[PDB]
Design a protein around this nucleic acid. Structure first.
Length: 155
DNA sequence: ACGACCAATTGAGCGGCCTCGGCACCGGGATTCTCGATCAGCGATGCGGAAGAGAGTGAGGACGAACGCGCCCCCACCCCCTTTTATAGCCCCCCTTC
């Protein structure tokens, strides 16, 4: 996390409660959009320091997350990839991945190119799995993502 | 004096069987209409499969270029103009004879 990032007390409390010890605890953090939930997610990734997967409910959110990661973290643009049907960044070429539940949770036949990344995603283990707007997660298709992706801790 | 009782009379009202079946209430009957699930709806997402917009390069355009030839100029420099005289044949214009 670049020192430009400013962390508010409630944000710090939520992170301290999530990182009660040297081991990250899985669970849900409820913060308003104006409260900078994105920064907490980025901070958690910077804390875990391991390969992480961010999933948004829309392509607009995926764009927002990319901007926020660049805005708040030392990570370079090439190190971030937005695995999406509409756009390609050679996800296998970098460690940080961003996508959507509609893509990974997709029930119908995958495109040959998207299948390449998904198999790489399936085989790799994710240290942190950030889920945005998790109120949608209990959906029958979206919850499948949790069985498809292998993640050590999910926030 | 009449009031109740007694008798003979009798037949309407009554107590009852008869029977029953119209209706309602009561309860118990396969039920015309209930609810509890499925699928459909509105407006959104995303993915996956489809078209068009930009490209290339055939080629011939216009025409810049490169050359020779061409007309033309400004330029050295050279010769001729003019004068004198001797000298002669050569030549034309004119006069002159026939």
């Amino acid at each position: 996390l670049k020192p430009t990032a400013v962390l508010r007390p409630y944000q710090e409390k939520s992170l301290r409660k999530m990182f009660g010890n040297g081991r990250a605890r899985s669970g849900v953090i409820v913060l308003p959009c104006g409260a900078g939930k994105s920064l907490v997610g980025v901070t958690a990734a910077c804390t875990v320091r391991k390969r992480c997967l961010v999933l948004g409910n829309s392509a607009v959110s995926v764009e927002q997350w990319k901007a926020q990661f660049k805005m708040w973290s030392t990570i370079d643009d090439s190190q971030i990839c937005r695995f999406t049907s509409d756009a390609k960044d050679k996800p296998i070429g970098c460690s940080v991945a961003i996508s959507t539940y509609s893509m990974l949770g997709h029930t119908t036949k995958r495109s040959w190119e998207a299948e390449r990344v998904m198999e790489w995603l399936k085989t790799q283990e994710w240290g942190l799995m950030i889920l945005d707007e998790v109120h949608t997660i209990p959906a029958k298709m979206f919850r499948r993502v949790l069985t498809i992706v292998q993640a050590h801790c999910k926030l």
